[PDB]
Subunit: 231 residues, 3 copies
């Protein structure tokens, strides 16, 4: 395990996701409100899935070698397995907060699936120049998602409770900033142009992942917006 | 890319799915009705997914070699990745049109999953005679789906709005004819008996795919059946 | 096929799932009640999926070799493909019976996904001692599911119809006993410590699978709890 310099960040990531999972699990024990239960379920599952995939990367299972540029390049494929399930759960948290219509939710989840799926294909593609074609398609799917979060959701939040409108606005802003960093790190890291070494890349993704999951969850689950308006 | 004679049909397929995706995306921009949004979301996602998988076939990612009959046989596995997601979306379009009950929708999607999954296993099976066992099981799942579309849905459409009944009937008929061709092409093509060469097989699937997705979508999204009855 | 001593149990399993599938399919033909249709759909799909995966194991497709302990160890990976889809369907049968809230259903299905997914990783892991780390995480996800079935569902059933409360209690008890055997068989069988040989392991899983699917389904589909209260 320690044979890879990036192991320290995989281990820290595993620990922080594990701790985040346990914290949300305990916190949600005292919850009976049916609406709050939905948000706790979604939000606890996110770091639990990430915990398993960080562990698989730490132990070496979630790593494969991909030939491109005349080299055997270490590619952590387990990231995409994580993201396939956790990024639509994160979007679902946002969509339920603002009572999004079903068509909009399906558009978001579908675009998200395309985003992660094409990122996976790009990560595993052996023809170097083609990796960036997949990156571009994935990034276009991301831009669609960000567009919807701003010009379909923000003006939906404003007709809702003030506490859900303010909580949505904060989580929207956190999401757009954090999620936009992922394609940049991929592009300059070992999957793309290879300018930033894998150990630093792994650190960067770990900070983004913990912030986008445990950070996000801490903000959401401390808000009164997750509860039905009750006396 | 041009090293494979079937590349021209993969390229045309990619282009037509891409163009179809953009057309539906633009067309749905001016839509606020919650019901119509569902149909636009579902129907736009279908060629978008197909676009990505056609591209993966064009660039060579979605192709693998399978030993059977003492030969290395080129198998485009990306078709099944496409179909796994797009065929239940197509069925969902039909089921929502007639306000199908939840049990029926689950039966359809489940049978569809079995249909595509067993087709994938058959496509990748190395014992030649066993490929046709999987083809038979998949075809039985197809026949179940077609049965339900006729003797569970058609008589559901008739108690609904005339515009939804007439639109459903047309899309049902398009679906049954087009979908029934797929097992025949598989059986006589490079996956099955090998009587029709891969380049012609690829052409045939491209025509079926564009018709079943973009053709289907053009009929559906031009109907007033996708809108709630409103003043 | 007969080259593997466990083939007889794979063949019997295939037959019993096939027969169970046909029986439930015929039985549900005379059903119009929308609630009952949901239970028939879910419950018929379960042995149908299991039938396909038992067949893939019989024909040899669903088997791979995994190096650990200095040996090439036969691992039937198709079990996890089965279980990935059938265990959440089984939980859905239970959850719908007691009209579980959406948050609880998502927690169950999510924990179940983690349970099966980590079992799959453990089954395919090449570092022997690490296989048991994945077994432990999977078992913890199982224990969460069993906890919810007892201390979240049982007291939900009691405020419902007596026929649904009594049917739920029986199916809950069947589920907890049968499902708890699976991690034990894995641990002592060819995936784990290797004390019980593969042919006996295969027998054990076949008895558990038929009981947990066809047995379970026979109890559920003969109950009046699956019908809406109607005059
Ligand atoms: C009911 O609605 C609220 C339940 O949501 C909360 C439900 C949770 C989503 C349940 C899912 C967590 C499972 C229990 C997962 C089990 C293994 C976890 C990964 C635990 C890992 C952390 C520990 C090992 C440090
Ligand atoms: C509604 C939304 C969910 C829409 C989803 C959007 C989605 C369509 C976007 C594209 C997803 C698609 C790229 C998934 C591809 C998975 C694939 C990378 C798995 C690895 O297999 C690739 C090659 C080795 O590089 O296998 C070597 C050759 C092997 C023989 C491969 C044969 C097995 C195939 C992988 C079977 C395909 C199954 C499905 C792709 C399962 C989806 C997995 C998940 C990653 C989407
Ligand atoms: C809101 O409900 C309506 C939105 O549906 C319409 C929503 C669409 C389903 C959004 C999904 C499309 C994504 C934007 C996919 C991005 C890449 C596409 C494959 C674009 C490819 C076509 C172009 C490259 C020729
Ligand atoms: C409700 C509905 C959705 C019901 C669904 C119906 C469904 C059950 C029908 C059968 C689906 C099943 C056949 C999927 C099999 C996928 C498999 C072909 C992927 C390729 O792996 C096959 C071999 C190489 O040929 O791998 C070589 C050996 C490798 C070590 C394989 C180990 C990895 C396994 C593939 C893990 C299994 C994961 C699940 C099958 C994911 C499902 C993918 C999708 C195609 C259904
Ligand atoms: C409508 O709601 C009730 C339908 O549920 C019942 C619907 C069923 C879930 C339909 C799914 C079964 C498909 C017809 C599967 C076809 C192949 C089966 C595996 C048949 C195998 C058994 C036989 C070959 C012995
Ligand atoms: C809401 C709930 C559903 C939550 C779900 C919980 C879930 C997160 C729990 C963990 C699931 C995760 C372990 C699935 C891993 C599948 C993996 C074993 C498939 C086989 O690939 C493993 C190695 C060979 O051993 O591939 C060799 C290297 C290859 C290059 C691998 C590259 C292809 C990757 C497999 C692509 C990943 C796609 C997704 C994992 C699809 C999920 C399949 C299913 C088994 C969950
Ligand atoms: C918890 C994990 C999260 C929130 C991950 C988010 C990841 C993305 C938004 C990834 C986006 C990518 C692209 C837009 C193109 C390049 C490849 C990706 C997959 C890194
Ligand atoms: C957009 C793509 C569509 C609508 C594809 C539909 C495909 C089918 C109905 C495929 C059916 C098959 C069988 C019935 C058995 C042989 C294998 C298949 C998968 C080709
Ligand atoms: C129809 C099949 C059923 C109901 C299978 C149930 C399987 C399980 C509950 C498996 C559990 C496992 C663990 C808890 C850890 C070890 C690995 C598994 C996957 C066997
Ligand atoms: C969105 C953030 C992307 C920028 C990442 C900056 C990383 C700087 C680290 C120094 C680069 C290491 C190069 C020498 C090894
Ligand atoms: C459902 C349509 C299946 C029939 C396809 C007919 C294809 C005819 C093309 C000629 C066959 C090529 C054989 C000589 C290369
Ligand atoms: C939950 C049941 C696990 C116990 C399984 C008992 C199997 C006993 C069979 C005898 C073991 C075979 C060892 C000699 C080959
Ligand atoms: C490819 C995996 C996509 C599914 C991820 C799980 C999250 C799905 C959330 C469903 C949202 C509800 C839509 C109506
Ligand atoms: C194996 C992939 C199956 C899921 C495909 C995505 C479409 C699912 C549509 C869900 C229909 C709603 C059922 C209640
Ligand atoms: C990884 C596969 C998980 C999906 C299995 C299919 C069963 C899903 C049942 C959905 C229950 C409804 C939740 C709201
Ligand atoms: C186009 C929608 C406006 C809100 C999205 C902001 C786009 C940020 C760009 C992210 C950088 C990705 C490379
Ligand atoms: C049995 C349901 C009647 C409607 C379905 C028509 C079946 C068409 C056969 C398709 C050919 C597949 C090989
Ligand atoms: C902790 C919840 C109480 C009900 C679950 C009973 C646990 C049975 C243990 C199963 C054995 C697995 C190794
Ligand atoms: C070796 C790099 C070749 C450049 C490929 C860039 C493609 C980016 C596509 C953006 C439309
Ligand atoms: C393919 C990228 C699309 C980003 C711009 C959004 C187009 C308008 C969509 C309106 C729902
Ligand atoms: C080499 C071909 C052997 C014939 C197999 C046909 C099987 C079809 C099954 C239909 C019930
Ligand atoms: C070779 C076996 C080494 C023992 C590993 C047991 C790990 C079990 C983890 C339970 C917390
Ligand atoms: C509760 C702490 C969980 C941390 C387990 C994984 C950390 C890796 C240590 C090497
Ligand atoms: C908008 C046109 C999209 C076409 C891109 C793929 C066509 C392949 C050209 C070689
Ligand atoms: C209807 C009987 C189904 C049995 C088919 C599979 C049994 C395997 C026989 C070798
Ligand atoms: C993006 C950083 C999130 C910070 C989380 C802090 C949570 C405290 C309530
Ligand atoms: C099956 C062929 C479909 C033809 C689509 C034409 C759409 C015009 C409205
Ligand atoms: C766990 C054993 C189940 C027994 C099923 C018998 C069904 C008869 C109604
Ligand atoms: C990591 C366990 C958290 C302890 C409880 C925190 C207050 C709910
Ligand atoms: C008003 C919300 C500001 C949140 C910005 C957080 C940036 C990481
Ligand atoms: C809305 C601001 C987006 C900031 C992008 C930051 C990418 C590192
Ligand atoms: C391909 C872009 C379509 C242009 C608009 C068509 C009329 C909505
Ligand atoms: C009355 C609907 C006829 C549609 C037939 C289309 C055949 C491709
Ligand atoms: C309902 C008519 C079906 C026609 C099947 C055509 C197959 C090529
Ligand atoms: C296996 C076929 C079952 C025959 C009908 C049983 C009574 C519904
Ligand atoms: C009162 C329900 C008892 C069911 C026990 C079944 C054990 C296999
Ligand atoms: C509730 C009793 C569980 C019995 C476990 C049996 C495991 C073989």
């Amino acid at each position: 395990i320690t044979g890879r310099p990036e192991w320290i960040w995989l281990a820290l990531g595993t620990a922080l996701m594990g701790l985040g999972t346990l914290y949300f699990l305990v916190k949600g024990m005292g919850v009976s409100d049916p609406d709050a239960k939905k948000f706790y379920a979604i939000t606890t599952l996110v770091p639990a899935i990430a915990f398993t995939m960080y562990l698989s990367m730490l132990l070496g299972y979630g790593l494969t070698m991909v030939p491109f540029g005349g080299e055997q390049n270490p590619i952590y494929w387990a990231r995409y397995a994580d993201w396939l399930f956790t990024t639509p759960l994160l979007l679902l948290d946002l969509a339920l907060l603002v009572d999004a219509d079903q068509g909009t939710i399906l558009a978001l989840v579908g675009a998200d699936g395309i985003m992660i799926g094409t990122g996976l294909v790009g990560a595993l593609t052996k023809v170097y120049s083609y990796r960036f074609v997949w990156w571009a398609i994935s990034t276009a799917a991301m831009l669609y998602i960000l567009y919807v979060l701003f010009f379909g959701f923000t003006s939906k939040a404003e007709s809702m409770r003030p506490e859900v409108a303010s909580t949505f606005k904060v989580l929207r802003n956190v999401t757009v900033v954090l999620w936009s960093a992922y394609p940049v790190v991929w592009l300059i890291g070992s999957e793309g142009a290879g300018i930033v070494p894998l150990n630093i890349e792994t650190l960067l993704f770990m900070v983004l992942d913990v912030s986008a999951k445990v950070g996000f969850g801490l903000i959401l689950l401390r808000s009164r917006a997750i509860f039905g308006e009750a006396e």
